[PDB]
Amino acid sequence: APQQVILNVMTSLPLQIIVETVRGNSALYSSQHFLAENKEWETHLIAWTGELEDKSKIEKKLCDASGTPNIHPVWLLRRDQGRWRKYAENVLWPVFHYISDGKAETDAWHDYVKFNEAYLNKIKSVYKPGDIIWIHDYYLLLLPQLLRMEFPNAYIGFFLHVPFPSSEYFRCLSKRSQLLDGMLGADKIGFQSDSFQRHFISCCARVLGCEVNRDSVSAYGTTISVETLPIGIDTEKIEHDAFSSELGVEEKVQALKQVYKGKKLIVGRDRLDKVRGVIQKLEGFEIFLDMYPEWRETVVLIQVSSPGYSHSANVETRVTEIISRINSKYGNLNHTPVLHYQMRVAKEEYLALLRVADLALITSVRDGMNTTSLEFVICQKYNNSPLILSEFTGTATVLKDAIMVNPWDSVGVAKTINDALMLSTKEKVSLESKLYEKVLSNTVQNWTSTFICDILSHSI
Numbered sequence: 001a002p003q004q005v006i007l008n009v010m011t012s013l014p015l016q017i018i019v020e021t022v023r024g025n026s027a028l029y030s031s032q033h034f035l036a037e038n039k040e041w042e043t044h045l046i047a048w049t050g051e052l053e054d055k056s057k058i059e060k061k062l063c064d065a066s067g068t069p070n071i072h073p074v075w076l077l078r079r080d081q082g083r084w085r086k087y088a089e090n091v092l093w094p095v096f097h098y099i100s101d102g103k104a105e106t107d108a109w110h111d112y113v114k115f116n117e118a119y120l121n122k123i124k125s126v127y128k129p130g131d132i133i134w135i136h137d138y139y140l141l142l143l144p145q146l147l148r149m150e151f152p153n154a155y156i157g158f159f160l161h162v163p164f165p166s167s168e169y170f171r172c173l174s175k176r177s178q179l180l181d182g183m184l185g186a187d188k189i190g191f192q193s194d195s196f197q198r199h200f201i202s203c204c205a206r207v208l209g210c211e212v213n214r215d216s217v218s219a220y221g222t223t224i225s226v227e228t229l230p231i232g233i234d235t236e237k238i239e240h241d242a243f244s245s246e247l248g249v250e251e252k253v254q255a256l257k258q259v260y261k262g263k264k265l266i267v268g269r270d271r272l273d274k275v276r277g278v279i280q281k282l283e284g285f286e287i288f289l290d291m292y293p294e295w296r297e298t299v300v301l302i303q304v305s306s307p308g309y310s311h312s313a314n315v316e317t318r319v320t321e322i323i324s325r326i327n328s329k330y331g332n333l334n335h336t337p338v339l340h341y342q343m344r345v346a347k348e349e350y351l352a353l354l355r356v357a358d359l360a361l362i363t364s365v366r367d368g369m370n371t372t373s374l375e376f377v378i379c380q381k382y383n384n385s386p387l388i389l390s391e392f393t394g395t396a397t398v399l400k401d402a403i404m405v406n407p408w409d410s411v412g413v414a415k416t417i418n419d420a421l422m423l424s425t426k427e428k429v430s431l432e433s434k435l436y437e438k439v440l441s442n443t444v445q446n447w448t449s450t451f452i453c454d455i456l457s458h459s460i
Contacts, residue, residue, distance in 0.1 A: 002449040004040045008032055009135040010047040013073055017051035017060055022344060024306065027371050030234035030444040036068050046123055048074040050081040072126055074118045087112035089309045092138045095172060096165050097275045097366050100311055109175060116142035124150060132455060137161050144185030157455035158186035161368045164196035167206045176207050184219055188455040190227045192368040192394040197228050225458040229451055230398050232442035233374045242351045242379050252352035264299045264421060267357035269372050271306040272316050277363035277390060277407050282322040284413025289330050291414050297335055304341040354379035359386060359420060363407035364393040377435045384432040386420040401434045
């Protein structure tokens with residue numbers, strides 16, 4: 001459904017070098033795929049991979065050669081590769097998320113600029129006048145200006161998957177002007193939520209002299225368009241996998257149904273981080289067990305977690321301490337209230353987990369979008385299990401009718417969990433209807449098509 005009369009640029013390639021990268025860009029990856037299988041225009045992919053003879057790079061290409069292909073990668077040689085991730089993860093990520101003492105920051109900045117430079121280098125290497133350029137996220141904040149300087153009139157769009165911080169937090173950055181500058185090269189810039197748009201605009205007016213209004217930031221004697229376009233999932237594929245007989249999700253669902261007979265299941269998947277709010281979920285769950293003796297022995301919380309980059313070590317320690325406390329207090333030999341899986345689970349196992357779920361709880365402190373909630377809503381269309389959503393997550397912006405909570409308010413989280421578990425059948429079915437068609441309203445495909453159309457629409 002993309003209009004007919006593309007380069008997609010990313011932090012990392014969807015596949016690691018030994019293969020598939022789970023690294024959690026699935027809504028994004030789905031968009032890339034949608035782009036790859038388009039026939040009206042064929043997409044080219046620009047990205048880097050930091051992994052654990054220069055034609056042996058073409059050995060790794062040799063069977064990183066699924067693709068369209070001709071996927072376009074970038075290579076950084078050096079030992080302590082993590083450096084590439086260091087400015088982005090140690091400086092930008094915490095600030096953008098409203099959150100480490102290094103004095104090597106300048107070196108990290110050096111690496112950051114190098115990263116962006118290599119991206120530009122490759123892009124110009126294979127660019128053909130008249131391309132449309134799409135770039136994603138914080139690793140590539142510099143790039144739009146480099147492309148605009150290198151090219152005066154190319155159509156360039158930038159989308160930020162992560163949150164954008166308020167001017168108060170953004171000012172902290174030493175390079176703040178260069179990052180803002182950098183971003184101002186795209187004709188069109190996209191955000192998950194209204195607040196991030198407002199914050200970016202405010203940043204552009206305060207840190208830089210640029211003159212702004214509610215949808216436009218104007219500088220260079222040029223006008224830049226900013227937008228709120230929350231990303232969607234690939235609904236058709238997720239629904240198909242969730243409910244297809246071939247993939248074998250059904251056996252797993254019935255097997256899990258067999259294991260947890262007579263028990264209510266709360267299922268969530270989050271990275272172990274400050275922002276994803278696992279701690280608040282566990283605290284609320286503990287309070288919930290505290291308040292309602294009726295639900296003791298009968299409620300099991302299943303949490304599957306993904307590893308964090310660092311300074312989430314204490315997050316893992318705290319989360320773990322709370323889990324140990326809850327299981328010590330309310331657990332026995334046959335019943336374990338909290339199940340914590342830190343291993344990578346299979347896609348079918350995951351979808352199974354979502355389908356068997358009697359509850360979904362999202363307690364994110366701050367994020368661009370919660371994919372898991374949407375996927376859960378798809379997985380519950382026939383079963384109609386309730387979703388509880390943090391008001392601070394970006395998905396609260398699109399799923400307005402969903403049950404809402406303040407994750408910091410643990411006692412409230414408890415009350416809400418009790419309320420959701422005790423919902424009448426019709427309430428469940430109706431709410432799931434509303435949320436389901438609301439999710440179905442924005443597909444990844446339509447979101448991706450709409451955004452390309454917006455980039456083109458403004459670059460006139």
